[PDB]
Amino acid sequence: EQVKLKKEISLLNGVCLIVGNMIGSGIFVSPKGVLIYSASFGLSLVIWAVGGLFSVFGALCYAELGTTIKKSGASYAYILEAFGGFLAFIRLWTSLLIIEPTSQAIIAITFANYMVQPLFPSCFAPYAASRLLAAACICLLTFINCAYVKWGTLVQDIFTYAKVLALIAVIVAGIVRLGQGASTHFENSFEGSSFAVGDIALALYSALFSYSGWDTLNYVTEEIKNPERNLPLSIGISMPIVTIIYILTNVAYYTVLDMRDILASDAVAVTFADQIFGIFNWIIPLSVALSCFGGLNASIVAASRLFFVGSREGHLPDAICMIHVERFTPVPSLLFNGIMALIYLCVEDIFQLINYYSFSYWFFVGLSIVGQLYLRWKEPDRPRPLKLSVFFPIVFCLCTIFLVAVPLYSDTINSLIGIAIALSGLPFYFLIIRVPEHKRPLYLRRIVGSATRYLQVLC
Numbered sequence: 001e002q003v004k005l006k007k008e009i010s011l012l013n014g015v016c017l018i019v020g021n022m023i024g025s026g027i028f029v030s031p032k033g034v035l036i037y038s039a040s041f042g043l044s045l046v047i048w049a050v051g052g053l054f055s056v057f058g059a060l061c062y063a064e065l066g067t068t069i070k071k072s073g074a075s076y077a078y079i080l081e082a083f084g085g086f087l088a089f090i091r092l093w094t095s096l097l098i099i100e101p102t103s104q105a106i107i108a109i110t111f112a113n114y115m116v117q118p119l120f121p122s123c124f125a126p127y128a129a130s131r132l133l134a135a136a137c138i139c140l141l142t143f144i145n146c147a148y149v150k151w152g153t154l155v156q157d158i159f160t161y162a163k164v165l166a167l168i169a170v171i172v173a174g175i176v177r178l179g180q181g182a183s184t185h186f187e188n189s190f191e192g193s194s195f196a197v198g199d200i201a202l203a204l205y206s207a208l209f210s211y212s213g214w215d216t217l218n219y220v221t222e223e224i225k226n227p228e229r230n231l232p233l234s235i236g237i238s239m240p241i242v243t244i245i246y247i248l249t250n251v252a253y254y255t256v257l258d259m260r261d262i263l264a265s266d267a268v269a270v271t272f273a274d275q276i277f278g279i280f281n282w283i284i285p286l287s288v289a290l291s292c293f294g295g296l297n298a299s300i301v302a303a304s305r306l307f308f309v310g311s312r313e314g315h316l317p318d319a320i321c322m323i324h325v326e327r328f329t330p331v332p333s334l335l336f337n338g339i340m341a342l343i344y345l346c347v348e349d350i351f352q353l354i355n356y357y358s359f360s361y362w363f364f365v366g367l368s369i370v371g372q373l374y375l376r377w378k379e380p381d382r383p384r385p386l387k388l389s390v391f392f393p394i395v396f397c398l399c400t401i402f403l404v405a406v407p408l409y410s411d412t413i414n415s416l417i418g419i420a421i422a423l424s425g426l427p428f429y430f431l432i433i434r435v436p437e438h439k440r441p442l443y444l445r446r447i448v449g450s451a452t453r454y455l456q457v458l459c
């Protein structure tokens with residue numbers, strides 16, 4: 001009965017946090033980032049499959065890591081127990097300022113856009129709506145996750161079911177248009193491609209960037225029923241599902257659209273629909289909005305638990321490690337994440353904020369893998385229920401080196417401002433965190449007063 005974040009995330013709610021968070025407005029809108037560089041369908045599908053394989057290697061690394069550690073945080077519990085503190089600190093701080101607020105605000109804006117879109121198919125949706133609809137979405141998901149976490153897993157479940165239904169719809173349309181005929185785009189000179197170290201590297205980067213989120217279940221891993229089984233099994237059931245969904249929906253696309261109008265189109269699914277569904281060409285913008293809703297709910301669960309864990313370790317203020325008394329949901333962490341996402345709804349060029357945290361994000365996943373190897377070396381006696389091999393940590397450490405080098409020479413000043421964000425986090429750690437609580441002024445008294453006032457949100 002004691003205040004503890006009860007588990008209540010089954011295997012199904014495990015597969016829905018990963019699949020949900022993963023397939024979101026990635027293959028729905030301009031997924032041709034792997035087609036611009038691999039200028040052919042055959043090479044495009046080969047690079048989809050290869051990026052999927054390498055994301056599977058990363059997800060198996062994280063299954064082993066999350067069954068080894070059994071602490072939520074998913075990049076912050078694996079840097080904190082392998083390395084120490086400071087690096088974990090600037091992983092919560094990068095996720096606190098730039099990574100999680102921006103990603104949630106962008107998913108909210110992209111949900112608003114494609115909710116409104118069937119009304120404004122050619123005209124661009126206004127900036128007044130498509131930001132107020134985004135704030136309504138963020139606030140609704142924060143409230144749904146703040147009331148009952150079973151509600152939050154339910155929302156995630158429903159909208160992941162919607163995602164998979166819509167993508168099965170487009171995949172079925174593609175297979176139909178392939179069986180009846182219409183196989184000109186496919187299997188005929190399929191690979192008049194652009195084999196080149198630059199182009200192949202950038203297409204692999206775009207694919208491996210498109211399967212992100214495989215580490216979403218690891219954020220909520222103190223709340224899984226028997227994590228030892230349900231975390232690796234849910235990851236290993238989610239990753240082939242999402243890889244298959246990706247390569248099949250791209251097959252469909254290529255079968256219907258063409259190399260020309262599949263580029264130079266804003267949201268290629270909303271092009272595919274216009275070519276096939278006809279009068280029901282609004283279903284696909286509706287499904288992009290639903291998939292963005294599922295992805296936003298998963299981002300909110302994961303970010304709320306990242307900040308909760310971060311404050312439980314002493315990094316974020318105590319007020320953020322607090323459960324609700326009767327509902328058992330991290331109310332102050334969720335309010336904080338919602339505050340941050342809504343603040344980042346006021347920014348105009350947020351899709352420009354993407355790239356800083358892009359480099360930093362893959363850096364931190366890499367540092368977590370490096371920490372897994374550090375633990376394999378230093379403590380080869382910790383109970384690891386699922387210990388696969390070293391081959392997967394090694395290959396995905398290499399793939400992380402690649403995914404970190406690509407945005408460091410392509411656009412370097414942005415990644416430098418990302419490192420600047422982490423450096424800006426540094427002073428709080430070297431001046432507030434590392435203080436042993438008995439050197440701070442009556443700022444402590446203010447902090448405790450505020451923490452009590454916010455304790456008056458659980459009662």
Ligand SMILES: N[C@@H](CCCC[NH3+])C(=O)O
Pocket residue numbers: 021022023024025026103209210211212213
């Ligand atoms: N992978 C999702 C984004 C969620 C990953 C977490 N930042 C996408 O492809 O759009």
